[PDB]
Every structure is written in structure tokens, then in C-alpha cells.
Amino acid sequence: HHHHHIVIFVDFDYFFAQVEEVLNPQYKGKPLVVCVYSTSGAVATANYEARKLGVKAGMPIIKAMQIAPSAIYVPMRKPIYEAFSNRIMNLLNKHADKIEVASIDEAYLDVTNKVEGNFENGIELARKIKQEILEKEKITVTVGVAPNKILAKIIADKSKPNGLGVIRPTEVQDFLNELDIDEIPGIGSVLARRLNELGIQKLRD
């Protein structure tokens, strides 16, 4: 193929922490960490200022505080983020031939019909969707536009934050050529590490 589809992948930037910045404007520009407990605590999401100090999703709060003492630490308020996500997903629904809500902050839009297979028009539609989420919900997102869901996410991972990544039908074959298996969504570190011990590092191996 590389035509039967025109996909727009949408991925919200540092979502939980960003929603918190939207609600408390005074957090913006400062290291911020949303915390999750499941007894003991870990980082759920850190905004960029906090990631810049080395804070990462999954890091124990104790180790986070040790490296980012000056950060602000708040509790996870899932209901509210679900509320935001809900609204954004519904908004996306209105521009898609078909929609896959992969998670609270990830969604795939099939828009081949919507733009009658015109690729360039798909890009523009994506751009308009970036802006529409920024205005209606004040949240910035990163998107990827490609011929299929898989490529749409990869280009998107490479364009954050706040990006618009594109892989036109014509640049696909060679894109795959230099793709690290490592970069394919769903290929976990465990499978990746095992292929590596076998000297398999790229899609062409």
C-alpha cells in the first residue's frame, strides 16, 4: 500500500503534568512532578524542566527528590486527566474516518476518506488539529502523519515535544531502510535486547 491509508497519530505532551500546568499556571516553567502510589511512590509524569534534571517516569520519588530537590511534587488526579482526554478524543473523533483510542493520551486517526486520499491535505488537517486542541483545551500535542499507524507513531516519537512529523508515501521505503528494530512501537526492551545479543539491530537484519 502506502496509499490505502493516510494516518494521523496524536500524542499529548507530558500529559498529566501538562494538565496540572493548565490548571495551575504558576507551575509553567518550573520543574514539576506528578506522583503515583500503588503505600510507596513513584514519578508518573515529569514536565520538561524536571526531565532536564534527570527525572523520569517510573523513578522512585525518593530518588527524584535527591536529584530534583527544587521541583514541585503533586499527586496524581487521574479523574481530571481522564476528563481532559475525554474531551480531546471526542474532538478528534469529528475529523476521522475511523479512530483508535490507544490510551488516555494516544489516538490514531484514519483520514484517507476525509481528505480523499490527498496526502498534503492530510498534513494540513493535522496542523489544524494541533491548533484546535491548543485553543479548545490549551494543551500542546505532537502528531505524526504517515501511510500507516506504525510509521505514524515512529515519526511522532522523533518529533516531540510539540511537533508535526511527516513521512510521505514516497520517502517510506528508505525510511524503513535505516530503522532500528529498537524504534518499533511494541518491541519492548526485552525482545530488543535479545535480538541485539544476536546482532540484529536494524529492520534489514
Name the residue ranges covered by the structural domains of the chain.
Answer: 1-14+78-178, 15-77, 179-205
- Residue 106 falls in the annotated catalytic set: yes
Domain spanning 1-14+78-178, CATH architecture: 2-Layer Sandwich (3.30)
The class of domain 15-77 in CATH terms is: alpha beta
Give the three-state DSSP class for 177.
Answer: helix
Beta-carbon contacts of 56 under 8 Å, excluding residues fewer than 6 positions away, are 43, 46
Residue 182 assigned to a binding site:
no
- The active-site residue, picked from 20, 106, 132, 197, is 106
Residue 69 φ then ψ, to 5°? -60, -35
Element (H, E) at 46: strand 41-46
Detail the DSSP E strand segments found in 47-189. Answer: 72-75, 98-103, 106-110, 141-146, 164-166
Torsional class of 187: left (φ above 0), alpha (ψ -120 to 50), beta (otherwise): beta
> Chain centroid to CA 159: how far?
9
Say which amino acid occupies 115: V
Element (H, E) at 78: helix 78-93
- Using what technique was this structure determined? X-ray
Å resolution of this model?
Answer: 2.3
* Half-sphere exposure for 76 (CA within 13 Å, toward CB): 16
Residue 157 assigned to a binding site:
no
Residues in the chain: 205
Which residues are bridge partners to 146 per DSSP?
7
Say which amino acid occupies 145: V
